[PDB]
Coordinates of all heavy atoms in Angstrom, one line a residue:
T1 CA 18.8 22.7 8.5 C 18.6 21.3 7.8 O 17.6 21.1 7.2 CB 18.1 23.8 7.7 OG1 17.7 23.3 6.4 CG2 19.1 24.9 7.4
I2 N 19.5 20.4 8.0 CA 19.4 19.1 7.4 C 18.4 18.3 8.1 O 17.7 17.4 7.5 CB 20.8 18.5 7.4 CG1 20.8 17.1 6.6 CG2 21.4 18.3 8.8 CD1 22.1 16.6 6.2
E3 N 18.2 18.5 9.4 CA 17.1 17.8 10.2 C 15.8 18.3 9.8 O 14.8 17.5 9.7 CB 17.4 17.9 11.7 CG 16.3 17.3 12.6 CD 16.3 17.9 14.0 OE1 17.2 17.7 14.7 OE2 15.3 18.7 14.3
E4 N 15.7 19.6 9.5 CA 14.4 20.2 9.2 C 13.9 19.8 7.8 O 12.7 19.7 7.5 CB 14.4 21.7 9.4 CG 13.1 22.4 9.2 CD 13.2 23.9 9.1 OE1 13.6 24.6 10.0 OE2 13.0 24.5 8.0
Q5 N 14.9 19.6 6.9 CA 14.6 19.1 5.6 C 14.5 17.6 5.6 O 14.0 17.0 4.6 CB 15.6 19.6 4.5 CG 16.9 18.8 4.6 CD 17.9 19.4 3.6 OE1 17.6 20.3 2.9 NE2 19.1 18.8 3.6
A6 N 14.9 16.9 6.6 CA 14.6 15.5 6.8 C 13.2 15.2 7.3 O 12.7 14.2 7.0 CB 15.6 14.8 7.7
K7 N 12.6 16.1 8.1 CA 11.2 16.0 8.5 C 10.3 16.2 7.3 O 9.2 15.7 7.2 CB 10.9 17.0 9.6 CG 11.6 16.8 10.9 CD 11.1 17.7 11.9 CE 11.9 17.6 13.2 NZ 11.3 18.4 14.3
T8 N 10.8 17.0 6.3 CA 10.0 17.3 5.1 C 10.0 16.0 4.2 O 9.0 15.8 3.5 CB 10.7 18.5 4.3 OG1 10.7 19.6 5.2 CG2 9.8 18.9 3.1
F9 N 11.1 15.3 4.1 CA 11.1 14.1 3.3 C 10.2 13.0 3.8 O 9.5 12.3 3.1 CB 12.6 13.6 3.2 CG 12.7 12.2 2.7 CD1 12.3 11.8 1.4 CD2 13.2 11.2 3.5 CE1 12.4 10.5 0.9 CE2 13.3 9.9 3.1 CZ 12.9 9.5 1.8
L10 N 10.2 12.8 5.1 CA 9.4 11.7 5.7 C 8.0 12.1 5.9 O 7.1 11.3 6.1 CB 10.0 11.3 7.1 CG 11.2 10.4 7.0 CD1 11.8 10.2 8.4 CD2 10.8 9.1 6.4
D11 N 7.6 13.4 5.8 CA 6.2 13.8 5.8 C 5.6 13.5 4.4 O 4.5 13.0 4.4 CB 6.1 15.3 6.0 CG 5.9 15.6 7.5 OD1 5.5 14.7 8.3 OD2 6.1 16.8 7.9
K12 N 6.3 13.7 3.3 CA 5.7 13.3 2.1 C 6.0 11.8 1.7 O 5.5 11.3 0.7 CB 6.2 14.2 0.9 CG 7.7 14.1 0.6 CD 8.0 15.1 -0.4 CE 7.4 14.8 -1.8 NZ 7.9 15.8 -2.8
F13 N 6.9 11.1 2.5 CA 7.0 9.7 2.4 C 5.8 9.0 2.9 O 5.3 8.1 2.3 CB 8.3 9.2 3.1 CG 8.3 7.7 3.2 CD1 8.7 6.9 2.1 CD2 8.1 7.0 4.4 CE1 8.8 5.5 2.2 CE2 8.1 5.7 4.5 CZ 8.5 4.9 3.4
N14 N 5.3 9.5 4.1 CA 4.2 8.8 4.8 C 2.9 8.9 4.1 O 2.0 8.1 4.4 CB 4.1 9.4 6.2 CG 5.3 8.9 7.1 OD1 5.7 9.7 8.0 ND2 5.8 7.7 6.9
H15 N 2.7 9.9 3.3 CA 1.4 10.0 2.6 C 1.3 9.0 1.5 O 0.3 8.3 1.4 CB 1.3 11.5 2.0 CG 1.0 12.5 3.1 ND1 2.1 13.1 3.7 CD2 -0.1 13.1 3.5 CE1 1.5 14.0 4.6 NE2 0.2 14.0 4.5
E16 N 2.2 8.9 0.6 CA 2.2 7.9 -0.5 C 2.5 6.5 -0.1 O 2.3 5.6 -0.9 CB 3.1 8.4 -1.7 CG 2.4 9.5 -2.5 CD 2.6 10.9 -2.0 OE1 3.2 11.0 -0.9 OE2 2.0 11.8 -2.6
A17 N 3.0 6.3 1.1 CA 3.3 5.0 1.6 C 2.0 4.3 2.1 O 1.8 3.1 1.9 CB 4.3 4.9 2.7
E18 N 1.1 5.1 2.7 CA -0.1 4.5 3.2 C -1.1 4.1 2.1 O -1.8 3.0 2.2 CB -0.8 5.4 4.2 CG 0.1 5.6 5.5 CD -0.6 6.6 6.5 OE1 -1.6 7.2 6.1 OE2 -0.1 6.7 7.6
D19 N -1.3 5.0 1.1 CA -2.2 4.7 0.1 C -1.8 3.5 -0.8 O -2.6 2.8 -1.4 CB -2.5 5.9 -0.8 CG -2.9 7.1 0.0 OD1 -4.0 7.0 0.6 OD2 -2.2 8.1 0.0
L20 N -0.5 3.3 -0.9 CA 0.1 2.3 -1.8 C 0.3 1.0 -1.1 O 0.4 -0.1 -1.8 CB 1.4 2.9 -2.5 CG 1.9 2.3 -3.8 CD1 2.5 3.4 -4.6 CD2 2.9 1.2 -3.5
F21 N 0.5 1.0 0.2 CA 0.5 -0.3 0.9 C -0.9 -0.9 1.1 O -1.0 -2.1 1.2 CB 1.2 -0.1 2.3 CG 1.2 -1.3 3.2 CD1 1.9 -2.4 2.9 CD2 0.5 -1.3 4.4 CE1 1.9 -3.5 3.7 CE2 0.5 -2.4 5.2 CZ 1.2 -3.5 4.9
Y22 N -1.9 0.0 1.1 CA -3.3 -0.5 1.2 C -3.7 -1.3 0.0 O -4.4 -2.3 0.1 CB -4.2 0.7 1.4 CG -5.6 0.4 1.8 CD1 -6.0 0.2 3.1 CD2 -6.6 0.2 0.8 CE1 -7.3 -0.1 3.4 CE2 -7.9 -0.1 1.1 CZ -8.2 -0.3 2.5 OH -9.5 -0.6 2.8
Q23 N -3.2 -0.8 -1.2 CA -3.5 -1.6 -2.4 C -2.8 -2.9 -2.5 O -3.3 -3.8 -3.0 CB -3.3 -0.7 -3.6 CG -3.9 0.7 -3.6 CD -5.4 0.6 -3.7 OE1 -6.1 1.3 -3.0 NE2 -5.9 -0.3 -4.5
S24 N -1.5 -2.9 -1.9 CA -0.8 -4.1 -1.9 C -1.3 -5.1 -0.9 O -1.1 -6.3 -1.1 CB 0.7 -3.8 -1.6 OG 1.5 -5.0 -1.7
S25 N -2.0 -4.7 0.1 CA -2.5 -5.6 1.1 C -3.9 -6.0 0.9 O -4.3 -7.1 1.2 CB -2.4 -4.9 2.5 OG -3.1 -3.6 2.5
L26 N -4.7 -5.1 0.3 CA -6.1 -5.5 -0.1 C -6.1 -6.5 -1.2 O -7.0 -7.4 -1.3 CB -6.9 -4.3 -0.4 CG -8.4 -4.5 -0.7 CD1 -9.1 -5.1 0.5 CD2 -9.0 -3.2 -1.1
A27 N -5.2 -6.4 -2.2 CA -5.1 -7.4 -3.3 C -4.6 -8.7 -2.8 O -4.9 -9.7 -3.4 CB -4.2 -6.8 -4.4
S28 N -3.8 -8.7 -1.7 CA -3.3 -10.0 -1.1 C -4.4 -10.6 -0.3 O -4.4 -11.8 -0.1 CB -2.1 -9.8 -0.3 OG -2.3 -8.9 0.8
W29 N -5.3 -9.8 0.3 CA -6.4 -10.3 1.1 C -7.4 -11.0 0.2 O -8.0 -12.1 0.5 CB -7.1 -9.2 1.9 CG -8.5 -9.6 2.4 CD1 -9.7 -9.4 1.8 CD2 -8.7 -10.2 3.7 NE1 -10.7 -9.8 2.6 CE2 -10.1 -10.3 3.8 CE3 -8.0 -10.7 4.7 CZ2 -10.8 -10.9 4.9 CZ3 -8.6 -11.2 5.8 CH2 -10.0 -11.3 5.9
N30 N -7.6 -10.5 -1.0 CA -8.6 -11.0 -2.0 C -8.1 -12.3 -2.6 O -8.9 -13.2 -3.0 CB -8.9 -10.0 -3.1 CG -9.7 -8.8 -2.6 OD1 -10.9 -9.0 -2.3 ND2 -9.1 -7.7 -2.5
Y31 N -6.8 -12.5 -2.6 CA -6.2 -13.8 -3.1 C -6.4 -14.9 -2.1 O -6.8 -16.0 -2.4 CB -4.8 -13.6 -3.5 CG -4.1 -15.0 -3.8 CD1 -4.4 -15.7 -4.9 CD2 -3.1 -15.5 -2.9 CE1 -3.8 -16.9 -5.2 CE2 -2.5 -16.7 -3.2 CZ -2.8 -17.4 -4.3 OH -2.2 -18.6 -4.6
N32 N -6.0 -14.6 -0.8 CA -6.1 -15.6 0.2 C -7.5 -16.0 0.6 O -7.8 -17.1 1.1 CB -5.4 -15.1 1.5 CG -3.9 -15.0 1.2 OD1 -3.1 -16.0 1.3 ND2 -3.4 -13.8 0.9
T33 N -8.5 -15.1 0.3 CA -9.9 -15.4 0.5 C -10.5 -16.1 -0.6 O -11.4 -17.0 -0.5 CB -10.6 -14.0 0.8 OG1 -10.0 -13.4 1.9 CG2 -12.1 -14.2 1.1
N34 N -10.0 -15.8 -1.9 CA -10.7 -16.2 -3.1 C -9.6 -16.7 -4.0 O -9.0 -15.9 -4.8 CB -11.5 -15.1 -3.7 CG -12.2 -15.4 -4.9 OD1 -12.4 -16.6 -5.3 ND2 -12.7 -14.4 -5.6
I35 N -9.2 -18.0 -4.0 CA -8.2 -18.6 -4.8 C -8.6 -18.6 -6.2 O -9.4 -19.5 -6.6 CB -7.7 -19.9 -4.3 CG1 -7.1 -19.9 -2.9 CG2 -6.7 -20.6 -5.2 CD1 -5.8 -19.1 -2.8
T36 N -8.1 -17.7 -7.1 CA -8.2 -17.7 -8.5 C -6.8 -17.4 -9.0 O -6.0 -16.7 -8.4 CB -9.3 -16.8 -9.1 OG1 -8.9 -15.4 -8.7 CG2 -10.7 -17.1 -8.6
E37 N -6.5 -17.9 -10.3 CA -5.3 -17.5 -10.9 C -5.4 -16.1 -11.6 O -4.3 -15.5 -11.9 CB -4.8 -18.6 -11.9 CG -3.4 -18.6 -12.2 CD -2.9 -19.8 -13.0 OE1 -3.8 -20.6 -13.3 OE2 -1.7 -19.9 -13.2
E38 N -6.6 -15.6 -11.7 CA -6.8 -14.2 -12.0 C -6.3 -13.3 -10.9 O -5.8 -12.2 -11.2 CB -8.3 -14.0 -12.3 CG -8.6 -12.6 -12.8 CD -8.9 -11.6 -11.7 OE1 -9.4 -12.0 -10.6 OE2 -8.7 -10.3 -11.9
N39 N -6.3 -13.8 -9.7 CA -5.9 -13.0 -8.5 C -4.4 -13.3 -8.1 O -4.0 -12.7 -7.1 CB -6.8 -13.4 -7.3 CG -8.1 -12.7 -7.3 OD1 -9.1 -13.4 -7.4 ND2 -8.1 -11.4 -7.3
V40 N -3.7 -14.0 -8.9 CA -2.3 -14.3 -8.5 C -1.4 -13.1 -8.9 O -0.8 -12.5 -8.0 CB -1.8 -15.6 -9.2 CG1 -0.3 -15.7 -9.0 CG2 -2.4 -16.8 -8.6
Ligands
LIG1 C1 -13.4 -14.5 -6.8 O1 -12.7 -13.9 -7.9 C2 -13.3 -13.9 -9.2 C3 -12.4 -13.3 -10.2 O2 -11.5 -14.3 -10.7 C4 -14.7 -13.2 -9.1 O3 -15.3 -13.3 -10.4 C5 -15.9 -12.1 -10.8 O4 -17.3 -12.0 -10.3 C6 -18.0 -10.8 -10.6 C7 -19.3 -10.9 -10.0 O5 -19.2 -10.7 -8.6 C8 -18.0 -10.7 -12.2 O6 -18.7 -9.4 -12.5 C9 -16.6 -10.7 -12.8 O7 -16.7 -10.7 -14.2 C10 -15.9 -12.0 -12.3 N1 -14.6 -12.0 -12.8 C11 -14.0 -13.1 -13.5 C12 -12.6 -12.9 -13.9 O8 -14.7 -14.1 -13.6 C13 -15.5 -13.8 -8.0 O9 -16.7 -13.1 -7.8 C14 -14.7 -13.7 -6.7 N2 -15.5 -14.2 -5.6 C15 -16.1 -13.5 -4.7 C16 -16.9 -14.2 -3.6 O10 -15.9 -12.3 -4.7

């Protein structure tokens, strides 16, 4: 094993978490830099 299959779950958690947090953070950077209601 249950620990060896728990390393498998967090290995594929960490791949899609990094690419998808980057889009959530870059879109928030563009709003705080450039106030438009298009960017809300
Ligand atoms: C701030 O955000 C607006 C979007 O609301 C940007 O306006 C775009 O500007 C590009 C040119 O750089 C145009 O091709 C787009 O059509 C524009 N979009 C809209 C909805 O007008 C604006 O450029 C941003 N400011 C900066 C400095 O990047």
Side-chain angles (χ1 to χ4, degrees), residues 2-40:
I2 186 165
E3 174 204 290
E4 187 194 290
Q5 79 185 357
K7 296 189 184 183
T8 307
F9 163 67
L10 281 172
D11 268 341
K12 68 185 290 183
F13 170 77
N14 287 148
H15 288 86
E16 280 80 5
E18 290 179 352
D19 303 299
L20 203 146
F21 176 64
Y22 191 89
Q23 307 294 139
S24 182
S25 54
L26 185 62
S28 64
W29 166 266
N30 290 287
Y31 170 72
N32 294 277
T33 302
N34 181 15
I35 297 293
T36 58
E37 200 170 4
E38 189 270 331
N39 283 116
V40 171

